[PDB]
Amino acid sequence: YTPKAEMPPEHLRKIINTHSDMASKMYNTDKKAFLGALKYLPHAILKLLENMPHPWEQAKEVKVLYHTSGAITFVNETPRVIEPVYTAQWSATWIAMRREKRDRTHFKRMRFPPFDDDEPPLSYEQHIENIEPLDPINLPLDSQDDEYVKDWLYDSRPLEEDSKKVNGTSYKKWSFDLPEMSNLYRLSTPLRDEV
Amino acid sequence: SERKAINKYYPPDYNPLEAEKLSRKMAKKLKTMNKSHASIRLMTPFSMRCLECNEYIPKSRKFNGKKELLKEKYLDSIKIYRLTISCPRCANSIAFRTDPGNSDYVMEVGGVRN
Amino acid sequence: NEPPPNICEQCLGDEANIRMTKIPQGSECKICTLPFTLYHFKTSKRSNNIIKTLICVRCATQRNICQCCMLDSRWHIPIQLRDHLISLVVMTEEAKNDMMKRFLSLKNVKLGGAQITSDPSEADNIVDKLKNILLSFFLYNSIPEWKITDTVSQLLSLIVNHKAKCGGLRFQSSELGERFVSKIFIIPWSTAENIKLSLSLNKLIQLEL
Amino acid sequence: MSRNVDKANSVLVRFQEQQAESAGGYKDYSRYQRPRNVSKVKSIKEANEWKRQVSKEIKQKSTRIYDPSLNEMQIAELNDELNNLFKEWKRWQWHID
Amino acid sequence: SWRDKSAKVQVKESELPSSIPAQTGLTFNIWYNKWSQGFAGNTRFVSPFALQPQLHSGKTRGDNDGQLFFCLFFAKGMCCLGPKCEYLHHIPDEEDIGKLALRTEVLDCFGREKFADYREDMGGIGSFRKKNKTLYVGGIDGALNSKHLKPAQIESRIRFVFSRLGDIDRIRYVESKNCGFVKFKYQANAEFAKEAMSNQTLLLPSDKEWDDRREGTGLLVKWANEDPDPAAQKRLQEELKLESLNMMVHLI
Amino acid sequence: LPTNHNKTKLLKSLKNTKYFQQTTIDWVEAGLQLCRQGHNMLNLLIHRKGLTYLHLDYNFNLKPTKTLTTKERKKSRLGNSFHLMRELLKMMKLIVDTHVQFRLGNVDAFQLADGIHYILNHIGQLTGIYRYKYKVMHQIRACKDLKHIIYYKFNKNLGKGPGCGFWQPAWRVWLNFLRGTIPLLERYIGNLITRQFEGRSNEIVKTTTKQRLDAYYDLELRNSVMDDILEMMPESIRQKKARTILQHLSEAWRCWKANIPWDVPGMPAPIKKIIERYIKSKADAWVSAAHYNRERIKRGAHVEKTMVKKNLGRLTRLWIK
Amino acid sequence: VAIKKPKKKYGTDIDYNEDIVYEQAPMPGIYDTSTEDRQIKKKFEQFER
Amino acid sequence: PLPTKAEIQECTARTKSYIQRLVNAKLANSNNRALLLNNSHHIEVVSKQMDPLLPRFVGKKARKVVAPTENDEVVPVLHMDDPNEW
RNA sequence: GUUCGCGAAGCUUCGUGGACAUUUGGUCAAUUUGAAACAAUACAGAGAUGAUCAGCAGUUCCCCUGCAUAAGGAUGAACCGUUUUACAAAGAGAUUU
RNA sequence: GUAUGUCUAAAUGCUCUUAUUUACUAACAAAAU
Ligand SMILES: [Mg+2]
Numbered sequence A: 001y002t003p004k005a006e007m008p009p010e011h012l013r014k015i016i017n018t019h020s021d022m023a024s025k026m027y028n029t030d031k032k033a034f035l036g037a038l039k040y041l042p043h044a045i046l047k048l049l050e051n052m053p054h055p056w057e058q059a060k061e062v063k064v065l066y067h068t069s070g071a072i073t074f075v076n077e078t079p080r081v082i083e084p085v086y087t088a089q090w091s092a093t094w095i096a097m098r099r100e101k102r103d104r105t106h107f108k109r110m111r112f113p114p115f116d117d118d119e120p121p122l123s124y125e126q127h128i129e130n131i132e133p134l135d136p137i138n139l140p141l142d143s144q145d146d147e148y149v150k151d152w153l154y155d156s157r158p159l160e161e162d163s164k165k166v167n168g169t170s171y172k173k174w175s176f177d178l179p180e181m182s183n184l185y186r187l188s189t190p191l192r193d194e195v
Numbered sequence B: 001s002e003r004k005a006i007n008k009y010y011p012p013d014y015n016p017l018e019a020e021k022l023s024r025k026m027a028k029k030l031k032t033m034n035k036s037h038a039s040i041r042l043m044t045p046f047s048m049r050c051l052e053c054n055e056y057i058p059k060s061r062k063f064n065g066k067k068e069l070l071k072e073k074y075l076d077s078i079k080i081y082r083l084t085i086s087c088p089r090c091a092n093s094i095a096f097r098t099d100p101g102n103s104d105y106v107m108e109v110g111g112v113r114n
Numbered sequence C: 001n002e003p004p005p006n007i008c009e010q011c012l013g014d015e016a017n018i019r020m021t022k023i024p025q026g027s028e029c030k031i032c033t034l035p036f037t038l039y040h041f042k043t044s045k046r047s048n049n050i051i052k053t054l055i056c057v058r059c060a061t062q063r064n065i066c067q068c069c070m071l072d073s074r075w076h077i078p079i080q081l082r083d084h085l086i087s088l089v090v091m092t093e094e095a096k097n098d099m100m101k102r103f104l105s106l107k108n109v110k111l112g113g114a115q116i117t118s119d120p121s122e123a124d125n126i127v128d129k130l131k132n133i134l135l136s137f138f139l140y141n142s143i144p145e146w147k148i149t150d151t152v153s154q155l156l157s158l159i160v161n162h163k164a165k166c167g168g169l170r171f172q173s174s175e176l177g178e179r180f181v182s183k184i185f186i187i188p189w190s191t192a193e194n195i196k197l198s199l200s201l202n203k204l205i206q207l208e209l
Numbered sequence D: 001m002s003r004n005v006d007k008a009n010s011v012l013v014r015f016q017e018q019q020a021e022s023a024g025g026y027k028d029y030s031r032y033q034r035p036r037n038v039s040k041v042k043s044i045k046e047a048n049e050w051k052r053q054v055s056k057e058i059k060q061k062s063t064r065i066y067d068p069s070l071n072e073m074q075i076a077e078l079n080d081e082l083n084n085l086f087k088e089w090k091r092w093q094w095h096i097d
Numbered sequence E: 001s002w003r004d005k006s007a008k009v010q011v012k013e014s015e016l017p018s019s020i021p022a023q024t025g026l027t028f029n030i031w032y033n034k035w036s037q038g039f040a041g042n043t044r045f046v047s048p049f050a051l052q053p054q055l056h057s058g059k060t061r062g063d064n065d066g067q068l069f070f071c072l073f074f075a076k077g078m079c080c081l082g083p084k085c086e087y088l089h090h091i092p093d094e095e096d097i098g099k100l101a102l103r104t105e106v107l108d109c110f111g112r113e114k115f116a117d118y119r120e121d122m123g124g125i126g127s128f129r130k131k132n133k134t135l136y137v138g139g140i141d142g143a144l145n146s147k148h149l150k151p152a153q154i155e156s157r158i159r160f161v162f163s164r165l166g167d168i169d170r171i172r173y174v175e176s177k178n179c180g181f182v183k184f185k186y187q188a189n190a191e192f193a194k195e196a197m198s199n200q201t202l203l204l205p206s207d208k209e210w211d212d213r214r215e216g217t218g219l220l221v222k223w224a225n226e227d228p229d230p231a232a233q234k235r236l237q238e239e240l241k242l243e244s245l246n247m248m249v250h251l252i
Numbered sequence F: 001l002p003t004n005h006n007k008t009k010l011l012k013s014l015k016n017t018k019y020f021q022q023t024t025i026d027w028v029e030a031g032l033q034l035c036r037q038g039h040n041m042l043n044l045l046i047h048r049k050g051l052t053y054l055h056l057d058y059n060f061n062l063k064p065t066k067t068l069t070t071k072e073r074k075k076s077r078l079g080n081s082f083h084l085m086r087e088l089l090k091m092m093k094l095i096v097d098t099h100v101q102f103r104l105g106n107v108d109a110f111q112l113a114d115g116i117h118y119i120l121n122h123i124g125q126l127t128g129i130y131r132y133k134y135k136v137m138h139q140i141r142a143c144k145d146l147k148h149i150i151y152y153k154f155n156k157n158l159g160k161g162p163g164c165g166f167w168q169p170a171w172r173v174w175l176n177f178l179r180g181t182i183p184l185l186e187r188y189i190g191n192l193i194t195r196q197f198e199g200r201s202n203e204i205v206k207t208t209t210k211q212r213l214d215a216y217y218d219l220e221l222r223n224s225v226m227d228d229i230l231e232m233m234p235e236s237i238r239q240k241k242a243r244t245i246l247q248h249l250s251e252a253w254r255c256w257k258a259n260i261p262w263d264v265p266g267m268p269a270p271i272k273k274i275i276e277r278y279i280k281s282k283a284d285a286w287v288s289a290a291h292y293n294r295e296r297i298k299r300g301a302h303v304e305k306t307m308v309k310k311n312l313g314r315l316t317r318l319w320i321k
Numbered sequence G: 001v002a003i004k005k006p007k008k009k010y011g012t013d014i015d016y017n018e019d020i021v022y023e024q025a026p027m028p029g030i031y032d033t034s035t036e037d038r039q040i041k042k043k044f045e046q047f048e049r
Numbered sequence H: 001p002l003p004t005k006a007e008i009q010e011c012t013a014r015t016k017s018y019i020q021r022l023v024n025a026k027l028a029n030s031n032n033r034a035l036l037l038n039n040s041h042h043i044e045v046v047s048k049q050m051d052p053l054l055p056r057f058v059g060k061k062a063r064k065v066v067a068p069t070e071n072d073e074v075v076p077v078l079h080m081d082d083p084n085e086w
Numbered sequence I: 001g002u003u004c005g006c007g008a009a010g011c012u013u014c015g016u017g018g019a020c021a022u023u024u025g026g027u028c029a030a031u032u033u034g035a036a037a038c039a040a041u042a043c044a045g046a047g048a049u050g051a052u053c054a055g056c057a058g059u060u061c062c063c064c065u066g067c068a069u070a071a072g073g074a075u076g077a078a079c080c081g082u083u084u085u086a087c088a089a090a091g092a093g094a095u096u097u
Numbered sequence J: 001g002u003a004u005g006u007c008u009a010a011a012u013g014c015u016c017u018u019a020u021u022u023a024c025u026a027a028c029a030a031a032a033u
């Protein structure tokens, strides 16, 4: 029937924050709900992991379902891509990585875990406000060779909404012109290396 | 949660030396740790008779004893211990000492060896 | 398979349409502590507070009572009272034990009296039988204070011990008292002899402990 | 630290106890030995707790001393112990407040 | 007259209604909200608040809508919702009682399920099997901070607190048992009183120990196990008989 | 080949209720929520279980506060479900944590990528899943293989060092692993929570187990013998006699084992005969079993030390006989 | 008198009556039985006293 | 007589329907995924969708329950009719 | 508020008839009194058998850990006690009618 | 595999000693050239 109400994220955030110091007879049932939710926590994990923003992406917005109790939150969308485009993107990223390696005398590899065992993971509200997330991995393009792909190649939804090159916002089917395809192929030389 | 647990959780502020000091301060006050006759499980090597009710507790029979330190050591730097037991039937405190000169024990106003 | 809910006329409401939800093994019955389907209805759509069923159908059947009201299905009287009446013309002993209560619930005997209430024959007969059977100021000289207070009000803090029988009313106003005197069981200010004696005795009793 | 006592008096546990005492005021008057000389206890609550503990001890003593082997000397000894406990209890009922 | 006396109530504001638990134990159990790994502490602590009803009692959001059940929090004396509370804020009057007398078997005046068996300590929300209007009062020593008072005085105090809270049937202080039996007209009223006076001090401002009333332990208000001595029993029987008669009359 | 029937995925069902509502969220935010929510769940469950002394880090590494007494330990041994869940949560945190770091000015995009890659390859070292479910070992191996391949492709002209991104295949592998778990965890974790709410009535043990088989068999035999004896002749107060019969049977068995002739004078022909027959049956079952065991031993076929000892003893006895 | 502390919801076999089996309503039913029972119980009150 | 074919079929249907129903009920009960009147007055029963996190059957808690036999009718246990050897 | 019509003042404003949209949520209400457990102190303290020890079951209106129809729980818990009648036949001696 | 069970009314800081342990647990396993 009638679709779900697109709620504000703010509400969700508030809900989450409420169930941090949860120890009253108020939300007795919320604790029960939380307990129940273990059932689907692995599913949730799988979802979230699946939606991992790719290195050509500063920050992915993602669809989310969440129990109004605040017990569990599923990333809802399943991330589909235009396969060749995706491959091209990956190739580009690979190239960038290689370049970085070439450049850097020492490459500062992360320490693990990234936050301390004592320190409770900062809420998202500490770094919404923070400066523009630093630039992601997308190689230096050129207008002559990669003329067609450059505008969209590194976008969250690899090809834009409301275009004639994909089905639409559902992003279920794609049809490409030749030159763009050619460009993609050229890009993907590292990965698609097939006989 | 598992007997071979590598690391016990500590609070985020746990100055270990300080903690130790605190414990020490609250060790004189403490009931257990500040007492004698600390428990032990032991089998009986002597195989002896409980002097009150004549219950013939045989060799190797297991008991939850009390080991206590005897202040008067043997020679100099090798300690000797009183090892309290109860007879099964009557609750008479049997005990024995471990004088290591003979590599054996001594009865201590509990029962008699036979 | 499930039997139907036994909710009384006054319990349920005054309207020709009520919507309710059933919650199979919702709660444990209060008597028996054994899972059963909760029916809960709102009476009128907008009238606040729900009416959940507090007992299992079986238990209700046994006691012959409304699953909400806990009153006789027929006469709408508390179980004690209804049973008491029957006795007057034997009462139920709910066994208040973890295990035994459940067992009792599962038995299907109609505990005690319930049978009489159920049958038109028996209930009616009982009723008939019953019918036949039927056919400042101190205060001195047992009855409750809520009655005394009412009386005082009519006449227009009110302490009364019963072992003493010595009620020291304190209106704290000269107006209220002087109205109270004119508008009118010994009542002084702050067989008479017999009464005095009795009062004295009462006082003594009060004072020995 | 087998047999539980050791675990109880392991340093970590002690530290935890201390922390509790500091913040909120959880003491275990079972855990510490009751003091010998009263009037080194300005707080009332503490005193009350001590009294309670001694009462408990007395009760425990009572429970055991009516055992069937009445002629054994342990019982006799306890009789004196019981008396001592009673005395202690009485003392604890001092008249400062 | 609570309706025309006031509308407002606001007993204890939502800034400071309560801290959540009181530290027994070492660690705090998130699921039960009760301290664990230890149990040392008599636990019962005196209410920071109280029902001064003449001041507090008022119209509510419930009154307008036609709520049956009275506000537990109001009774306790800490209903931060106040005028926007959905439960009623006044001492249960007779009319109200009459109105909810159908439901009063299964659940209290607070709209919460009466049980089949009494709690072993007679401690809370009485059984639907045994109707009752009769409260055990106890811990009166502790509620008055171990004050050397006259029994009579104590009794008077009890009366003062309880009369205000509901229409009294009869009250008895006892020196030997060290208690205060109260009986009410209506069960609902009794329940309300119990709710109010649970963990309450019996002390007054004029007393010298007013500022340290918090440090004590409050009134232990519970349900009355029926009095065994014979006159009382006889009276009870008579009452029962009367009730039966009334019922019969209603029936015919 | 997948489900013909099932359209109804999990999320859809949830959506169909009123209790879920849906927003659009930044992925990092979502991750954070998951971490927090997940953490809460694990604490809440733990607290319910009663064990308040196993403290969860916010990194999901669970470990005990004090050293637990034995009773406490017994109470508080969580199993293969809960631990698995914890591990999963930890993994999530690690990937989510890296992204959080990236978002914050703390770490470059390249660095973030590399970190992610490290996590996915090093799941094995980074956090114990494998401990609790040791088929994650396969996944780990696969990841390692990928790393080997990917690194060799990626560092051809370029030299050895850290900074290889290209986490994709590893990520994919982990996702696929998670698929399998979803089901297992839903049975496991779900079951656990059910137990916590409503904890089992009358479980039935199963004699297909190596342990308990023999005893069970013996019991059955005894029962059969008793039944036969009952069938045989009339008795008054037979319960008492049953015990005696059982004892007799036992004695007979012992005799057989020893190779003593079990001749008792009072034993009436029929009952005695029946007992003899059942002991013969037992012997047949026993001797054959022993032989089988011996054969197994000869092969090298997962014999129990105790079982082997028994065989040695039994076989010796047989030889003697 | 102090009761035996319960372990996991058991019955105190004084009250409640334990798992009762019926008298089994028969054909030659007579009401003197109840009276007899009452009489018997009367004596035990006296004993208690 | 060996029972009538039609009758047999009917019996099968009855039991088949019943057993199937029972199985369905059981399935419903399992926690893994994959109108009325009182007295004269008419009343609509509903089933509200509870939240999928909270325990489905919040009533049940694995309770022990002793049942009475409740055998009111008396079973007739009918029958017919060297001790030193046996 | 949207608006599609009627009637008055100067397409702008008032006054009206309609259409559109139409009964949420609660088995729950925030601290002692409707029921969590460990822990702690004290006191004892470990299946047969003489002793020491393994494992398996069994009965139950006892459960716990365990995903568990694995496995593990003090040999997981309590079982070790009480125990006089479908009551007969024969012989000998004694008091009462 | 670190057993177990009953039992429960609702002085302050100070420092100095160490190349150790009155340490405890035994459920686990047991052979020679
Ligand atoms: Mg064992």
Ligand SMILES: [Zn+2]
Residues within 6 Å of the ligand: C007, C008, C009, C010, C011, C012, C066, C067, C068, C069, C070, C071
């Ligand atoms: Zn009703």
Ligand SMILES: [Zn+2]
Residues within 6 Å of the ligand: E071, E072, E073, E074, E079, E080, E081, E082, E085, E086, E087
């Ligand atoms: Zn309120």
